[PDB]
Every structure is written in structure tokens, then in C-alpha cells.
Design a protein around this nucleic acid. Structure first.
Length: 56
RNA sequence: AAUAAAAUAUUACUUUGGAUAGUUUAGUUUCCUGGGCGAUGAAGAACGCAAUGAAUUGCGAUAAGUGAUAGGAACAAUAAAAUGUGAAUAUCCAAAAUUUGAAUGCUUGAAAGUAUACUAAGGUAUAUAUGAUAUUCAAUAUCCA
């Protein structure tokens, strides 16, 4: 057979096929554009940047 | 010999101190009933959430609270809004339940992360040992054409 090492033979490997769902959590993303952004910073430092540097 | 400034003694009032008396939403002991946690993720820890909260209490991205069922007119420190078309309040119910923790894909120091499969982002499953079933294999180990 020209080699010495004996290894574990490769057999069939089916994928996971559960008979019932593992979770019933609602498919709702709890991180959207309304939850990511809380509110703009409204301090004098933040108001200077919006004018000159064109940044919010 | 003399002085009563100091010193000493008594009482009244005031002061520093918190004894004494009155009191208890706290304890101690005994007895009765139960002794009802967790991979369907427990106990513990961490972080966050109130219009004004630092702790504490209650809660989990549906946040000092949601639905439902009872309940009958309040809360209050200050404003607001809602409210008999139902406010408080109660619950072995329903939905929901962040990061961890036996902690269980891999890693974890105070570590930020990250691989594959299924249904860009999200959500599921994948630790170790183990029982039954199914399937694929290994060894001439026993026969055997």
C-alpha cells in the first residue's frame, strides 16, 4: 500500500436534519436605523463641526 | 498682718453628652404545612432601563413595565399627558426575557474576536461522556466461493 500510517476511513456524513425547530424566536431585527442612532449631540462643540467641517 | 484675682463648696439657669423613662414596621425560640431548581439553560455575577435617580427597589432592548383576567377613581416632590370607552392595585396565566455563568463550536486577562452549515444583517445547530434506531465503513477476527 506504500504507506505505513493507518487513519480513520472516511464514511458518509449527512447534514443535520432536525425533526422540529430548535427555536421559535420571531424573525425581527432588534437593530435597525431607528435603534442604532439615539440622538444628535447638541453641544457648542458639536455645533461648530457641522458648520465648518460639514460633519454631523 | 491684709487681698479675694485664682482655688474651693452649695443651689438656680444655660451649655457639651446622650444616660434614664415611654415606644416598636426588628429579632430569638418552638410548633404546623410544604420541602415545588437546571441543557425547555438554574443559583451566582455583570451591564442597562424612570420626565427630572446616586444608592436601593422592580424590570430586560416590549426596560420602576406589555397583554389577559379580577379590580373599581387615583398618584403626587414638581410639572405634563392619560383616565368610568376603565387610574391605581393583584397574579402559580400569555408574550418577552441583554453579556456571562454547569456554559456546551473555538478562544477569553481586564479579550477586542472568530470557523462551518441552514434559514448582506439577524436567528438557529455544532463541547465531553452516553442508550436505542438508521446509514456508511474497518479488520481474513471465524467460516467461506
Amino acid at each position: 500500500r506504500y504507506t505505513t500510517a493507518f487513519h480513520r476511513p472516511a464514511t458518509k456524513n449527512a447534514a443535520k436534519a432536525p425533526k422540529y425547530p430548535r427555536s421559535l424566536k420571531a424573525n425581527r431585527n432588534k437593530m435597525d436605523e431607528f435603534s442604532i442612532i439615539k440622538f444628535p449631540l447638541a453641544t457648542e462643540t458639536a455645533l461648530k463641526k457641522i458648520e465648518d467641517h460639514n460633519t454631523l
